[PDB]
Design a protein around this ligand. Structure first.
Ligand SMILES: [K+]
Ligand SMILES: [K+]
Ligand SMILES: [K+]
Lengths: 524, 524, 524
């Protein structure tokens, strides 16, 4: 179709303009004195929220170019949240800060490529400074503390998470679901989890958590790609009877078959969910078998000459429950006999001996870990469905936060870690004045978060910023109480992983925009 | 879709502008000298009314932003009426008052978060002052008086309500329906009430009371979530024959299924209404059964392996009548055999012995109380359908009013309780000048109701206001007679619950708006 | 339909204007300091890229005339990439340079035909100078080096390519596909490749590479033209079952039949792709048999009186994979028995004896070479699907680059070969002043690439250009490091084939435009 093409500066102001709408709408929620954003719904009363992620989701601009700018940082910032369970808004305000100054520099005539290189250098240094600033989270005493803070000072949640992590280990898989009534429950079940998500939304039946949740579903394990639902029919009808949902784990589910599956399940004509098998190549076939054993199913591989039409309800695997993310599938409580599952572990465990490679050995250990490890299940009790649903949410959040803390530690929150780290890189330089400016653009941008928070609090950003810089370590401003002190002691922290991610992603999209010379889009 | 985003002040004036249309349209009806609002209907002659709730229902603005403002206070104020059976208009004029001054303060540069905190502090104090001013309504002599006043001085209605409350107790369930002829009847029957409202309006067939009222309906008790009307068809056709309405009580009724139900019943193609089962977890499954027993129906649980398709008219429960609120479902006169119902009570009653927990013991006691307690049924007689329908309405109102009076007592009406309470909080202060202004904003707003009432009467608001403040306790102005004196003695009161609710809800939405910085809506 | 006709200058500015949008959008990506171009997608976030080919694909202008100019160079420049696996962007910036000056000359009154003749003369000389500048790439030590450079300094890739070329020879067919896991595999299998492309895009299911890729497909060999899908039905339904894709190799696939195929496959209703049988006349029927034998299929020739309707799944040929280009079809790993395939080779090989004509002998030699030769298959291993997919892409690129290097050698990259060659043709003249100008127009244009690269780097083009001219051989500017030196030594090279192609194609379309006097298009 006829396109609308914009070049250089003309294109860049459009982008900036677009990210400014996104950033301005989202940053007002930042900090403890964050404001409310009202999101209109065609049906009923508007939604009032202080959640930057909710606000960002709703942002789409009419001007095609401006919209491209917003969608660009919007996409990258979302990754920060996916990665550490937080930091989307932060990444967004950081991106705005970097992009704004970056573009000014460009307009002044400085080289885009050098500005980007400088920004990157500054960020790389900043990330290292961040690790040095970081305090470890390893003993379950600390784990409980971080969980309590992430749960809005709910010691119960911290306790719950620490207990679960103790059961299945720090690397263990931990799941959280509705409780059966005023009282939590923690149980480890035959189970497993791989890095594959729904092959399409819509399968989503839990819009809240944006996940697919099937109960007592059959599991189809097909070592091949399914493109036409013609092979499915025989098996889909057996699943139609028995009246149970279906999980399809194949090499992939494409076109006509996926399309048909997205529709039917979206019409109550049998609940089905499809996800790619884990991994690729040979080890992908080994894992399909692992799942098989675990779920007492049978893998239907073409190699051996098997056909999906000849597949019967008995070839199907089975587990009490399955949950599917955008990029995660976790099978809860398989039917496989301990005899089977335990012999499977035994096999893999012995192959680890014959392992003639470190890589090969690790990959095998990975698999036994999944089969043998199992799955921790936290049931959140509460007395009144509301309080229960509410706490369940707080648990899910604190869990994701704690997970990250255990991985990369914690640093001062409230935007002070970023400002602290930036104050330490004053002498950092690059290969030319352009890169040096790029570096300063990044260091200045690192003050955006704190400044915004202070701004939302109605205090003078430059004064608080100035003071915090004057201090050391995790010394900072507690926006909530207007008191300076040790941020960690005052319980205002962020998993080092979320701050690191927010910065890296923000810098990433900012770098790309600063180095954009042309934009192509459809005619209005 | 491309959105229209507004920030800060630009957004706030739009909101204010919108709530002003709503408030101005509704407040003219306030007080005894309230004016008429003409509401146009596409068919026939317009409706002339003095009912603020009817007027508010019709308010929707063309400007998207202004409309969001109106819809926001509209939604919160409606809650006041739901909670105490009155106070929506009041909450609305209070909200306008708080929002107007609050925004001025914001424009002057004061901090929104502090203004809100101050408003809240003032309201918290006001509510406590309201409890202190309140006169108890406990003996059935008082109950009758309050009911008489709420029924426009009809001693009969007061007598009726007092008798009913005496039968089933203050906590009892009391229902009212058309009489069989010039003479009231009061009977306690098999019945129950639980805290679940319609899963969607539209099911509403009594716009007046905003309730769904089904007669001799069939009750489907499904232990599971219904998302596709495909499972319903068999049962929906069995109900199509017989020609009776249907109540769906499932774990939930979502998307496709709900959507289809909302439509069909909105086209006379079978009257249906769906509501969530009461409670959650295990106890939700026990209650579903209680209802079943009570209605002589059978629960259709997937656990036991039952399917909705294989559900026959005999599995359905039945009762002479069911009334559904925004948050309440009440089953009147179930078909369940005393044998069954009494045996059920026996079970639960024994479980209370084996109860190894205070909590568990209390929950069981709740259930027996519901089952064993039944429901009081008032049949309003009159001699001429017209007088009967009229009096029936006055009884329903007085009932809701008295219910509230019994819960939290009564205070002077005509807006004087709010002005009285405000006059007592003059020295109330917060943590800074901004919060102090917020407090004053709230105290001033508390005069809005009275002032408006006096204004509608054509008197000088500031003069009456001033005089009433000079007095004490429930001394105030009787707008109807232009005489000052004891508001309670003069029979001009409000259940303390409705005044408390109106204030808290108004303050709630006002606080949210004052702290709004961004608004997102669709492009016109 | 009513047309819009433009003549002379009015038409030419429109064209120029159109190629300027295309060239300006694409050239900003050129050097190692190339900028990003953001390409909008109706769904989701925009695409950020530095790939001139992606950008060019998206360019379409609203003005019909301007659009014709863009599409014209766009089509010819694409051929450069098809021919040598690179050079599209270059060809485009060259075309812009030639067209711009060429048109100025025309406006000044110089003869278009002479200008073109001069441009061509200069290009013919330039191409010869390019062969002379060229360094050979013959021993596998060189082949590995060129592959390593083309794979971003990944020695592994060079090694892989060298090994494969060593197996099947420099003329051999080399294929690359996903690995089975962290480790490369190289195997020679039964296969063949002929010069016939998809009979229609759309069949394309790998937009990235712009190729059709079918796995375990059935191959229909029909010696005749297929114009109506009525003959297909029986065979298409046999393929619908089994659930495998289909490759139609017939004399041709026209109208109704092609139309239907394009659609159905574009709806998941069976993946099909059709291409013309290789060659023509008699030898066309011979090769169809060659393919049949190789894939264990059966040729359905009308001559013998066979009908497509009577064709069964067994008549169909089969291979693990087939890949189709714009102008190439390559069948990977056929099912035909070694016995058959080797007996066929035996036949042809004897016919080479009986050959009574050098021409006939050569043609036969070509066929046995394809049959006997096979296809090398490179499986790229990596440990994590992502790294694997990434490396696979680098391998495919390096492969195409090395193929070209082996054919015509390598020359200095970064645009210096073109500038070097131009500097050597200063005294080149034609038959009149108009041709002489044409020559200078071309020689000047040859500086475009380097100058643009230098420009994107933020350096003064004329200065770098001037210095590089002053040197000799492959002495040039390394835009990446800002250092002058031997371009080949510094590892900055281009297969002589891509530079030659880029220039000839650019000059080709430029010559056509310079000699355009009229343009006809539809009315807006
Ligand atoms: K917040
Ligand atoms: K009134
Ligand atoms: K490039």
């Amino acid at each position: 179709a006829a396109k609308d093409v914009k070049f250089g500066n003309d294109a860049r102001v459009k982008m900036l303009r677009g990210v400014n709408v996104l950033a301005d709408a989202v940053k007002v929620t930042l900090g403890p004195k964050g404001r409310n954003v009202v999101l209109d719904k065609s049906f009923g009363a508007p939604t009032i929220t202080k959640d930057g992620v909710s606000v960002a989701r709703e942002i789409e601009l009419e001007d095609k170019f401006e919209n491209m700018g917003a969608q660009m940082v919007k996409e990258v910032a979302s990754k920060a949240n996916d990665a550490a369970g937080d930091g989307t808004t932060t990444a967004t305000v950081l991106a705005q800060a970097i992009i704004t100054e970056g573009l000014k520099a460009v307009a002044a005539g400085m080289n885009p490529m050098d500005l980007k290189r400088g920004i990157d250098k500054a960020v790389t240094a900043a990330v290292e400074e961040l690790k040095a600033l970081s305090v470890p989270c390893s003993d379950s005493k600390a784990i409980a503390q971080v969980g309590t803070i992430s749960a809005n000072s709910d010691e119960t949640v911290g306790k719950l998470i620490a207990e679960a992590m103790d059961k299945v280990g720090k690397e263990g898989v931990i799941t959280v679901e509705d409780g059966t009534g005023l009282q939590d429950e923690l149980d480890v079940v035959e189970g497993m989890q791989f890095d594959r998500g729904y092959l399409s939304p819509y399968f989503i039946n839990k819009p809240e958590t944006g996940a697919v949740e099937l109960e007592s579903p059959f599991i189809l394990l097909a070592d091949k790609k399914i493109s036409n639902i013609r092979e499915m029919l025989p098996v889909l009808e057996a699943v139609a009877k028995a009246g149970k949902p279906l999980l399809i784990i194949a090499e992939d589910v494409e076109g006509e078959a996926l399309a048909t599956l997205v529709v039917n399940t979206m019409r109550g004509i049998v609940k089905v969910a499809a996800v790619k098998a884990p991994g690729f190549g040979d080890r992908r076939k080994a894992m399909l078998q692992d799942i098989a054993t675990l779920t007492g199913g049978t893998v239907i591989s073409e190699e051996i000459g098997m056909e999906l039409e000849k597949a019967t309800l008995e070839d199907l695997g089975q587990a009490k429950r399955v949950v599917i993310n955008k990029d995660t599938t976790t099978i809860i409580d398989g039917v496989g006999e301990e005899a089977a599952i335990q012999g499977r572990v035994a096999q893999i465990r012995q192959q680890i001996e014959e392992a003639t490679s470190d890589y090969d050995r690790e990959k095998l250990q990975e698999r036994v870990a999944k089969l043998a490890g199992g799955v921790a299940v936290i049931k959140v009790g509460a007395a009144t469905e509301v309080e229960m649903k509410e706490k369940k949410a707080r648990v899910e959040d604190a869990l994701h936060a704690t997970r990250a803390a255990v991985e990369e530690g914690v640093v001062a929150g409230g935007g002070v870690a970023l400002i602290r780290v930036a104050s330490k890189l004053a002498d950092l330089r690059g290969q030319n004045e352009d890169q040096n400016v790029g570096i300063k653009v990044a260091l200045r941008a690192m003050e955006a978060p704190l400044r915004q928070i202070v701004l939302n609090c109605g205090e003078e950003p430059s004064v608080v910023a100035n003071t915090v810089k004057g201090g050391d370590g995790n010394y900072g401003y507690n926006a909530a109480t207007e008191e300076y002190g040790n941020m960690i002691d005052m319980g205002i922290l962020d998993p080092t992983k979320v701050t690191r991610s927010a910065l890296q992603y923000a810098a990433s999209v900012a770098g790309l925009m600063i180095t954009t010379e042309c934009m192509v889009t459809d005619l209005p």
